[PDB]
C-alpha cells in the first residue's frame, strides 16, 4: 500500500503564528491527471472535517488560514495564522490508489500564556452515602500549561486517587482536570480534614482546598 | 443539507457480528458510494471500502475481506456495514462518509460515528451523585460504576453548556467513573434550577439529578 508519514507527530503553536504540517507517500503519485491527497481537522468525539481537497483546493466554508500544496510525495498543510478553535488532530489521506490509506496524524497543541487552575473540592453527597461510599472530588479547572501534580487529614493517601485530563479547550486553549479519591464508609467516616492541595508552575505556593467535616 | 446519520453505541459479545447503519439526506442517495472507516481509540484511521448505492458494487480493503460486508438499501437511502466474527480487535468507531460521484474526491460529509465494543462482560448502569460545595460557583455531577462506555451528559439539557467540563472516564475495577464540573453566577444558583442529564444507552439509563445545596 501507500505508506503516508506525517510530521511532525505533535507541536506547540503560539496564537497568531504558523503551523507547517507535513506528509509523506512511501511512493511517488502517478501525473495522468489529479492527485488525490486531502486533509482534515479531527476534534474529540467528532468525525474528521474536510479543509483542503485535491492538494491545494479550500473546502467551501473553510477559511484561507488553512492552505496545502505538494507534488509526487510531498504534501503540506499551512495554518496561518494559529486560533484557538485549531486544537485538534490533523491527518492527510490519499485516495489515489486502493486501499486508501490516512496519515498517523499529527496533534496541533495551541500555546498560550500560563494559566492558574481554578480549585474546587467536594464532600460526597447523602445520596452516595446512603450506598455506604464516599467519594471526594476535587476539580482544576481552565489551567496552562498541561503538567500539574494534585495531592490529597494532616496526612496524604494516593490510593484511591483516580484522575482524568481534558483535551485542550477549542476557546481559551486552558485543561482542566479531575481528581477523584474514594475510600469506604466508615473508613470515611473516620476522618477529619480533607485537602487536595494542587501545585503548578503558574505558582511558587500550592493551591489548597480544603473542608472539615 | 447534506446528513450521514449513524445508530448508537453497541456492545457486542466476540463471535458475533453487528450491522451499522448509516442513512443519507440532503442529496440523490444513488449520485456518490458510501465510504466507511475504522478508527481505533487513540488511533488513526483506515478505509474498510465502499459500495455504489446505484448498483450494488462493492469494493473492500483486502485487510477487511473476513471482517466487513456492505450492503444498502435504496429504499431509505441507508448504507449499512456488517462486521463478523468479531473480536477486541474490532472495538473502535466506524464512521460512514459520503464517496465518489462523477469522479474520485475527499470525504466531504462524515457520519457522526459509531463506537463498537466487544465484550462478553455484563452492562452496568452508573450511580449519579451529585456535588454541592464566589462570585462564580462550581458543581459537578459523579457519574459511578458504568460498563461499558460511553455515556453522555449534559447540564439544563444543553442551554446551559457555556462553563462546562465534562472528564474523560477512567476505567478502575472493570468499571467507569467519569465526573462533570458547571460554573455559572452567585446570583443564578442555588437562587434557580441546576441539574446533570445523564445517558447511558447500553443500559437505557437517563437520570436527572438536581444539585442541592447542602
Known amino acids: 500500500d501507500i505508506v503516508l508519514t506525517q510530521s511532525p507527530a505533535s507541536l506547540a503553536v503560539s496564537l497568531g503564528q504558523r503551523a507547517t504540517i507535513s506528509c509523506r507517500a512511501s511512493?511517488?503519485?502517478?501525473?495522468?491527471?489529479?492527485?488525490?491527497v486531502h486533509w482534515y481537522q479531527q476534534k474529540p468525539g467528532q468525525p474528521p472535517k474536510l479543509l483542503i481537497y485535491?492538494?491545494?483546493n479550500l473546502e467551501s466554508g473553510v477559511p484561507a488560514r488553512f492552505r496545502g500544496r505538494g507534488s509526487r510525495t510531498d504534501f503540506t498543510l499551512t495554518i496561518d495564522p494559529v486560533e484557538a478553535d485549531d486544537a485538534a488532530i490533523y491527518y492527510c489521506?490519499?485516495?489515489?490508489?486502493?486501499?486508501?490509506?490516512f496519515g498517523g496524524g499529527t496533534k496541533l497543541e495551541i500555546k498560550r500564556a500560563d494559566a492558574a487552575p481554578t480549585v474546587s473540592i467536594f464532600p460526597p453527597s447523602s445520596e452516595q452515602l446512603t450506598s455506604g461510599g464516599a467519594s471526594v472530588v476535587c476539580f482544576l479547572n481552565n489551567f496552562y500549561p498541561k503538567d500539574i501534580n494534585v495531592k490529597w487529614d494532616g496526612s496524604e493517601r494516593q490510593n484511591g486517587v483516580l484522575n482524568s485530563w481534558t483535551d485542550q479547550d477549542s476557546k481559551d486553549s486552558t485543561y482542566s482536570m479531575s481528581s477523584t479519591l474514594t475510600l469506604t464508609k466508615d473508613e470515611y467516616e473516620r476522618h477529619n480534614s480533607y485537602t487536595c492541595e494542587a501545585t503548578h508552575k503558574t505558582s511558587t505556593s500550592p493551591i489548597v482546598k480544603s473542608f472539615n467535616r | 443539507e447534506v446528513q450521514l446519520q449513524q445508530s448508537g453505541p453497541e456492545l457486542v459479545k466476540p463471535g458475533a457480528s453487528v450491522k451499522i447503519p448509516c442513512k443519507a439526506s440532503?442529496?440523490?442517495?444513488?449520485?456518490?458510494?458510501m465510504d466507511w472507516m475504522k478508527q481505533s481509540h487513540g488511533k488513526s484511521l483506515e478505509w474498510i471500502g465502499h459500495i455504489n448505492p446505484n448498483n450494488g458494487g462493492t469494493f473492500y480493503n483486502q485487510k477487511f475481506k473476513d471482517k466487513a460486508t456492505f450492503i444498502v438499501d435504496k429504499s431509505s437511502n441507508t448504507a449499512y456495514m456488517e462486521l463478523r466474527s468479531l473480536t477486541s480487535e474490532d472495538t473502535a468507531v466506524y464512521f460512514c462518509?459520503?464517496?465518489?460521484?462523477?469522479?474520485?474526491?475527499?470525504?466531504?460529509?462524515w457520519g457522526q460515528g459509531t463506537l463498537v465494543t466487544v465484550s462478553s462482560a455484563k452492562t452496568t448502569p452508573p450511580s449519579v451523585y451529585p456535588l454541592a460545595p464566589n462570585s462564580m460557583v462550581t458543581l459537578g455531577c459523579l457519574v459511578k460504576g458504568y460498563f461499558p462506555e460511553p455515556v453522555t451528559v449534559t447540564w439544563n439539557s444543553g442551554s446551559l453548556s457555556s462553563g462546562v467540563h465534562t472528564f474523560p472516564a477512567v476505567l478502575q475495577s472493570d468499571l467507569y467513573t467519569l465526573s462533570s464540573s458547571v460554573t455559572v453566577p452567585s446570583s443564578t444558583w442555588p437562587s434557580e434550577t441546576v441539574t446533570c442529564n445523564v445517558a447511558h444507552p447500553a443500559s437505557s439509563t437517563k437520570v436527572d439529578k438536581k444539585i442541592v445545596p447542602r
Open positions: 511512493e511517488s503519485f502517478d501525473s495522468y491527471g489529479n492527485t488525490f
Open positions: 440532503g442529496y440523490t442517495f444513488t449520485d456518490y458510494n
Open positions: 462518509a459520503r464517496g465518489g460521484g462523477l469522479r474520485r474526491g475527499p470525504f466531504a460529509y
Open positions: 489521506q490519499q485516495n489515489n490508489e486502493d486501499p486508501y490509506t
Open positions: 485535491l492538494v491545494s
